[PDB]
């Protein structure tokens with residue numbers, strides 16, 4: 126495994142170079158803010174909207190995307206993946222200076238083919254593992270977000286040092302920056318969204334329903350299941366020292382005994398089989414198909430699931446809790 | 451439902467009264483710090499150890515437990531439940547001033563019979579839903595922790611106002627303080643520890659194993675499954691606006707579509723049946739039995755599960771990650 130930190134990365138490759146940040150959302154504003162604080166010359170490329178006005182008002186050298194790319198050596202494409210293909214073809218590819226570098230913040234856009242290698246220019250992924258605002262927090266708190274990187278096209282032979290110079294300027298090198306293919310990163314993102322995320326909430330919901338069906342106070346049921354933030358905190362503390370280690374160091378004897386009675390025995394094999402069924406759907410291409418179909422409806426059936434979800438006892442109870450507290 | 455806030459509670463019942471905080475751990479130090487900042491006269495009762503020295507060094511009027519109870523009108527018993535029975539019988543019950551109030555921070559000690567009603571004195575539960583340090587943070591941040599309360603013995607007719615005066619002084623009334631029996635609170639605590647907590651980690655682990663078994667980078671697998679804190683953050687953000695609502699407001703279309711494809715369909719009935727099997731074990735008394743047996747070994751078999759857990763691929767991978775980052 127190949128993991129770079131502050132000692133293995135240098136700010137030298139950015140000296141006298143202009144970085145263009147495309148977008149000024151939760152991702153864009155964080156990168157832009159850190160780069161500037163690290164002494165990197167940063168321009169903001171953005172469309173005529175509210176986000177553009179914010180960048181100008183916060184002192185950044187802000188123009189339309191095309192202008193920003195023309196006046197830049199490293200370009201950071203930090204807008205939604207839905208916009209990449211169009212912006213890439215019209216703004217980026219035509220104006221990208223000879224020997225310049227293009228970076229995306231995950232592999233979604235590269236796997237889709239919306240962003241592609243260009244003869245005479247470098248292309249990379251530099252994907253923080255924390256989305257948006259934390260990147261700004263961690264940085265100002267002397268820390269940084271862990272990140273993956275992949276050199277897609279190294280037509281200069283300078284991509285790696287420049288990629289890691291950005292990674293360092295933004296703070297990612299402090300935690301550490303590991304090498305991993307954009308394709309695998311994309312499949313981990315989708316897997317977290319399609320198996321893990323739903324399965325946590327389904328489980329949380331199952332606990333709520335069983336308590337309510339057994340005549341426990343619904344507001345209290347929801348509060349303990351996740352409403353407290355206690356389940357939230359455990360999973361954040363777990364990321365530091367380990368999930369079992371949280372129970373050992375923080376938990377009481379009555380808690381530890383009870384936890385360990387059911388640890389490794391709550392799930393039938395059926396769960397494992399679905400985790401593989403979900404991966405099949407991502408690697409095989411069955412999801413890539415599913416998604417295109419939703420987008421053709423204008424995400425009509427998605428907006429039904431949005432509204433269907435809020436009718437569920439859990440989301441009914443949540444509204445009743447927030448109102449009361 | 452009966453939920454009290456700042457407007458429905460008063461600091462008047464604490465004016466010219468002395469509050470004794472038994473213990474100075476993560477719970478004790480937080481209560482003590484807030485009470486003092488709210489202008490309440492607070493004494494600290496503690497045994498001859500490191501925790502006692504900390505209280506004295508931070509300016510608190512600190513003595514042995516028995517002395518603190520004798521010189522107090524409201525007593526807060528904020529030490530481990532293992533110590534309650536002994537401290538109660540020797541220190542509290544013999545010295546508890548006529549018409550004084552005893553409070554515990556959950557129902558564990560009351561259900562066990564270690565803390566009991568006394569003729570001529572008040573007894574209550576005031577249980578914050580966030581354990582330890584957050585109580586201090588939330589307070590200094592102008593906020594407070596949600597809490598449950600139960601009046602066990604109201605021999606004065608003044609218990610409720612004094613309980614809620616403490617609740618307000620500590621900050622719990624800001625969020626809100628709901629009425630709930632100590633017995634139910636105990637069963638929610640144990641249920642969170644025995645079904646939900648294990649089932650989250652089992653699920654997290656299942657995701658990790660499936661990814662590793664399919665030739666994904668183990669360090670990356672663990673990072674995405676919980677190591678990021680992204681799953682942690684979602685469940686904390688979920689407590690604010692709702693778990694499905696987090697996906698709707700923060701998630702991308704590709705994320706939302708994928709999440710909603712598997713939401714409500716990841717778990718077979720077997721899961722629901724165990725959630726009931728776990729409740730049976732807590733209400734029926736089968737767990738109360740299980741626990742006593744572990745304590746007779748001196749928690750020998752628990753220390754085996756502690757060490758067994760750290761051998762699991764997930765906890766092996768966690769060590770490899772933290773070291774690397």
Ligand SMILES: Nc1ncnc2c1ncn2[C@@H]1O[C@H](COP(=O)(O)OP(=O)(O)O)[C@@H](O)[C@H]1O
Nearest residue numbers: 148149150151152153172174176203204205208
């Ligand atoms: N279709 C589009 N074409 C170009 N830029 C866009 C488009 N849609 C949104 N943007 C820009 O992308 C940013 C949106 O950020 P946001 O929606 O918060 O997502 P993210 O977190 O991925 O940045 C803004 O700068 C906005 O102006």
Ligand SMILES: Nc1ncnc2c1ncn2[C@@H]1O[C@H](COP(=O)(O)OP(=O)(O)O)[C@@H](O)[C@H]1O
Nearest residue numbers: 473474475476477478497499501528529530533
């Ligand atoms: N057997 C005991 N008898 C009396 N006090 C005890 C005993 N064990 C621990 N304590 C006290 O209880 C506190 C322990 O706090 P800690 O272990 O962090 O748990 P908690 O979060 O429940 O307070 C300290 O003040 C300690 O001195």
